[PDB]
Symmetry: D2
Subunit: 393 residues, 4 copies
Amino acid sequence: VQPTPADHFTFGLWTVGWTGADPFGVATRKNLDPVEAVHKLAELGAYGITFHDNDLIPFDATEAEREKILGDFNQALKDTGLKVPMVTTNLFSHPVFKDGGFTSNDRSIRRFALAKVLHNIDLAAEMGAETFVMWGGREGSEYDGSKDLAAALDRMREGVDTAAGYIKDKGYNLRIALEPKPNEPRGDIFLPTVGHGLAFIEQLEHGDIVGLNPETGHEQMAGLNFTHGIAQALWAEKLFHIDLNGQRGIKYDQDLVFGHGDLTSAFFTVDLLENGFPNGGPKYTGPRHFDYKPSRTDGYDGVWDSAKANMSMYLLLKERALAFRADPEVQEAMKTSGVFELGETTLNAGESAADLMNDSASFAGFDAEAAAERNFAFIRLNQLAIEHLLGSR
Amino acid sequence: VQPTPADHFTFGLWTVGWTGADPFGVATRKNLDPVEAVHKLAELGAYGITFHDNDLIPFDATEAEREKILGDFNQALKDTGLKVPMVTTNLFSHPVFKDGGFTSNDRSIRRFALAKVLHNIDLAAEMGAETFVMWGGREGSEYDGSKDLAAALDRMREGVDTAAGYIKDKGYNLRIALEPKPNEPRGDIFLPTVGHGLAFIEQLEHGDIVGLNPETGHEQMAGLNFTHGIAQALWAEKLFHIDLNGQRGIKYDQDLVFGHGDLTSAFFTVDLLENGFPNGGPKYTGPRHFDYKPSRTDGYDGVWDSAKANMSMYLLLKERALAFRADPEVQEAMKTSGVFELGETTLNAGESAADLMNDSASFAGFDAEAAAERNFAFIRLNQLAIEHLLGSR
Amino acid sequence: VQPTPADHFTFGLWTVGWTGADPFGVATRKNLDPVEAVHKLAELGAYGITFHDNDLIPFDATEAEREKILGDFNQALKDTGLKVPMVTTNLFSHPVFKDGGFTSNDRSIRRFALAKVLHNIDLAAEMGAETFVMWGGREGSEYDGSKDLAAALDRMREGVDTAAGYIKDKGYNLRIALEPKPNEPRGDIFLPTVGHGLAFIEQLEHGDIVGLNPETGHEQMAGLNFTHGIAQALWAEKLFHIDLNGQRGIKYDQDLVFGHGDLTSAFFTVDLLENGFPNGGPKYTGPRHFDYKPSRTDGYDGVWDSAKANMSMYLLLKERALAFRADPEVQEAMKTSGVFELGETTLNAGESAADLMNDSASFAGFDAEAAAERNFAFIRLNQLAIEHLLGSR
Amino acid sequence: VQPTPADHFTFGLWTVGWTGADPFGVATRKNLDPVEAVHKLAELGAYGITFHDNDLIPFDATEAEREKILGDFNQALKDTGLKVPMVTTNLFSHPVFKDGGFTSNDRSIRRFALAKVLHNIDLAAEMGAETFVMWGGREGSEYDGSKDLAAALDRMREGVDTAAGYIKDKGYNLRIALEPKPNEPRGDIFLPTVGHGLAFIEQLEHGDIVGLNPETGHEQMAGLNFTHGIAQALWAEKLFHIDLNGQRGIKYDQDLVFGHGDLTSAFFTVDLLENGFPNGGPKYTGPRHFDYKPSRTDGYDGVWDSAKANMSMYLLLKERALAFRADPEVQEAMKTSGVFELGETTLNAGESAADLMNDSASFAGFDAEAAAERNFAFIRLNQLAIEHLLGSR
Ligand SMILES: OC[C@H]1S[C@H](O)[C@H](O)[C@@H](O)[C@@H]1O
Ligand SMILES: OC[C@H]1S[C@H](O)[C@H](O)[C@@H](O)[C@@H]1O
Ligand SMILES: OC[C@H]1S[C@H](O)[C@H](O)[C@@H](O)[C@@H]1O
Ligand SMILES: OC[C@H]1S[C@H](O)[C@H](O)[C@@H](O)[C@@H]1O
Ligand SMILES: [Mn+2]
Ligand SMILES: [Mn+2]
Ligand SMILES: [Mn+2]
Ligand SMILES: [Mn+2]
Ligand SMILES: [Mn+2]
Ligand SMILES: [Mn+2]
Ligand SMILES: [Mn+2]
Ligand SMILES: [Mn+2]
């Protein structure tokens, strides 16, 4: 332990503010005031806080109410020093968004949702946020005949490109990040994985300022490898923000503390974020944001314990991942396994497709049966990682 | 029933040729000769046959052996009239490909794999194939430390762009299709879903001739909605080929007959392929290829029954999907649910982002509580589809 | 297809009464007066209604209020003729039940939970129910060290045996039905599948009146085969009740209309309920109960439409499943496949183990390679089922 | 951490002997002489070895060959000191077993399968095994109409009761352990989870000597909690053997090294095996058996390295899990959380149902809102476990 603001640990107001209402029961904790959240998070070592528009401003609030609320919010920020690196919009709670915001079958709900996003971009800019996150939780269906699937993507593009053009038009220093989720609350959510979100961005007019906001638990709900998924976002220059938490299996979104889900996977996620790639390449330098929910069985001391635990987990794994990579036994194990060898291009500088085909050395006279004998020693290399993770080495 | 060549039903040689060896047991049927496969498939109504290089030419074969084999193959094609619309390479059976072809940690295996693909492009062109499919089944890992994840994607890009540049250089009338699979045989396979494959293509130098080959069962192994997934491929102008089969759940790749997995989902897949989108848009016009495996408990009469059953299933659902959409009760149900309304743009012709924000009608004075009362009637609309599917209407 | 009370369709009050609140948003529908639920279900063809103590009687109800409400609900039943075949207790909604009722860590809470069940058994007895369902939704944990697992099963045993002991003591004509669910709301729920439910029942002092209430979607939440799980329950004579609905994959509990999830699986469930086993055996004769939730996107015509969709789906599957088994072609296929040879004992009349090992024909000179030649033809048999399901036969 | 025979590590011959053939490719390693397996495992610290009849003795072995092979294998055991605690039968590899052994549709095949098991029980008895495992891998179906499900369970019962009856008849000191697997190679396997395994055992004439052999990966294949499933088996006193390995999600059976799958889950499995239940109860004392497969990418140093990784992982988890429970801080946390109050009966000494309902303190005047205020602090307790696991405490 000991997180400091330099670690860039950010928390959403809704994480610690999560009161416990689930599908089978009512809240188990008292509402948390947002000024209280800020003082408490700053006491713990956080660098910043994120929020959804309705986390701070009730759906109902009048302009006078809005201003009362923002002034205390801003004072708190001032008194503590926390930044506001990311802002997001609630397009899922109110009954109006029951069929989605941007891809609602109703045109007038679509306009209302886009209106709400546009206004929220103005608050984002005013707050000093660098990222605007979009989670399309109600965009999807339970039944396959509910939507025209091409029209749904057209409507998604229209929303995102209007938002994007508005940033560009106003000159805000903001990027858009899409947050994928496979299901829940909808049976099928559109752009369900990091893959679908990356692909979708390439069809946009204003894709240059649109990237992703992957969430550990969300890719694990489709049973995918989260390190692989973030690696491809990174590789594409699209890992703009990240949500860290835990998920044990393919079930409802659990949003456990980071490291309380798939531990081995969390260790390799930390190694990619902190250390980057073994042969060198891109590095993710944004905030380490925790999108989790404090277990409903626990009271407020559990809330603050859980906020701490997210930061401890990440620093404990960071430590073990630094020792792991620095270990000369591991570096040699890596070399034997061909980790560095993957880094060499397949073709020689200047060789063409017809030049290699025609190279007798790599095809006609290649000894495939000899080449197959190679002991990659991937088990041994996995054993060294686990032993570094167990604090054994 | 009655399929004819005009239906464009294509089968891989390995489907009907699947002898039954699984991870827990030996083959239960005798090898099937490829000339026999062609006569039998042509008798049934198929339009074409696809194959992997090693399905026809043993890994070991000499040029004299290659030519003996191709001449009988080509004669059979000639005598029956079946086309060869797609060809693919085996980069997974031989022990040399145990760490992958293109993303093998060993550089010399990478060159061998690319050599093998290049040579197979020449046979593809000679056969009259329009599509060259790439399934990267051994590209991936069991453990997260096994690979440098950026280097793996670099190596994947280098392979695919060399292949692509070679087509372009030679002027073959061929496109590349990537076939996604989440896992098996590898713990984690790279580009595991339609999403990841679409995204990956956008990072290529020669992406203009690279598209996808989605497989029903493969997206269902990540628990995804296959109709949604193909809809996004289509929408992107990237649905170049398709593999149809069945899968009951998230488990090993089952490759059941099409319609013997998720039936409701198969019905909507057929509706998108045959009918396209309710508001109009792109249409998939390629071959309807069945990538399935005849159950190992069944003998050869089951093989030919199973080939028939794939075509019957697709024609039975086609029929029900045509009746469903033609039904005036359904068209009215669709209209009530806003299916057509999704097709209208959100913004009015000429309206800007600042023009709608500022439109009092869609934000400040919008009645969200009134708008939330809308009965979308999605259940009723799903009930009409199921009733058309049950042959009830 | 029109349901009559003869059909035995029963609906939970909480099903049509579902308000639409989920984890990400508020209710989309006004609360349903129970009196109105009764009258409405009676006009649709329902046979009876089921409820949870708190669905009718609020947690904090005074005795004058409790009397009133019961007066109103008995009146409605008397007017309409609806029966009340099953009653159940809410041990999940109040914040007190955050760690469970029966298996809470706090002893005072376990006593309050058992007391709440005992009172509810009186009520069940007063309404004329035959079945008392226990759904242990809060029984389990998010974390592995949270519970003493042997002690959680003793605590579950204590509560269920006390309830069972009380039933017998009072002379009520009531059986207890346990209802498995693998996860949600807890990360792991105890007795997660039909198998675990059955196994626990065998360790009970009063297991003779304790059986199962399997739910379609719940077994599909662990990827199991619903038809196989209720077949084990039938076979053990412990299928006391059933909850019919749809689930589209391993994800949050969807509670879709019966037949709106896995369609083929629904078809074979209905065949099992209607036709029983091919070679004879126990048959289920209780209520066909629907535990579903009207999608929150739908408004009140949608609620009664969804109610009605359940009974339509069941009657359509039933029509097809009777047709399927009555078909000569199907019977012939069944014969070929060995469905009726499975029913023949393996041993001969008074043949012992020793007798069989010594029989040379069965082992020593058994021709294993000739016996492996059988064409089981299970694919053709599956094709016949689907053709009956699709009403093409 | 160095294993000694005192540790009781047992390995299947088929584990280190796995050749690397999977569904998509051929073997990557030469066959392993069993004599050599024995000697090698003996030098690593193995306590004993287990095998399948056909792992040692080929299907078609003549009697002179069978004698030889057994002579060779008994010699190796005598030289090394290795015990043979469990023996099992291959009822899945020959094409004859394509529809199962015990539950095949063909009666001649069921008789041959039972005969094959009876002979194998003699052999088990001759090798000194305490346990006889039955893995019904081919028992199940791909399609729902393939089997008469009540008849499949009677057929399973018949075979298992005959085997059990024969054991008792011969006076062998042998218990039968059933091993669940939910799917693969069949689409649905009968008795798919620990729960179903336990439930079936209660319908057996000779259930007293019939218990379970749960496998880590198999329960994780249905998304269940391995620790909860073996806790139910322990509690019912039916945990006769166990198979330890790793699984990374709901997918094909991976058989990774123990600890190379779900790490936290492994940690809590080891705590259950070593520490038993927090409030006391049955303890498992059999062999710690590893049913894994050396990844096919690895060559022979990798095979012995993987063997050794199993025992290292187990010893490292064991060191941490003993430390964890010995920690005062952990004990305090456990107290707070109610882990020890779960062990207190709910009822008082001679308190009846009637007594509790009438007790006003437990119901009528129970303060539910005050009792809901308890901070169970399960998150802090989970954090302590992980900190012990990571060796940071
Ligand atoms: O704004 C992004 C938030 S929205 C919503 O609270 C959700 O459940 C989260 O997973 C996303 O991170
Ligand atoms: O070439 C594409 C083939 S390769 C391999 O036979 C595989 O299992 C399939 O799913 C793919 O469709
Ligand atoms: O007690 C029966 C009910 S309790 C609760 O409403 C639950 O979610 C259901 O699945 C059960 O069937
Ligand atoms: O009989 C024990 C073996 S049989 C077979 O090898 C299987 O795949 C395993 O999981 C079991 O543990
Ligand atoms: Mn989440
Ligand atoms: Mn998130
Ligand atoms: Mn497949
Ligand atoms: Mn395929
Ligand atoms: Mn449910
Ligand atoms: Mn239910
Ligand atoms: Mn296994
Ligand atoms: Mn096993």
